Design a protein around this nucleic acid. Structure first.
Ligand SMILES: [Zn+2]
Length: 90
RNA sequence: CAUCU
């Protein structure tokens, strides 16, 4: 269930271990929760699913289990996300 | 899967 569509955001921080983090909406300057499984287009050259700090993503703000969460996170245009510094190359 | 370092 969608609150906002194809909104652009700047990833605030993402702990690759915990499997979640926050995306700051360029849209509204609000922080939005993001979980590893919401990453629709992951970097094919990284083992794990992650986003990197300072990275610009395109996502949907959906209603989640405990309030709003990000969904179908991709890069701008739908390109694969870049992924975290701490996720390893294949 | 809720503000981690
Ligand atoms: Zn969720």
């Amino acid at each position: 269930k969608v609150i906002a569509t194809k909104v652009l955001g700047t990833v605030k921080w993402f702990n690759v271990r915990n499997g979640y983090g926050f995306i700051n909406r360029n849209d509204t300057k609000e922080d939005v929760f993001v979980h590893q499984t919401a990453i629709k287009k992951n970097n094919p050259r990284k083992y794990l699913r992650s986003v990197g700090d300072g990275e610009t993503v395109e996502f949907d703000v959906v209603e989640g289990e405990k309030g709003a969460e990000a969904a179908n996170v991709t890069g701008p245009g739908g390109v694969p996300v870049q992924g975290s510094k701490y996720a390893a190359d294949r």
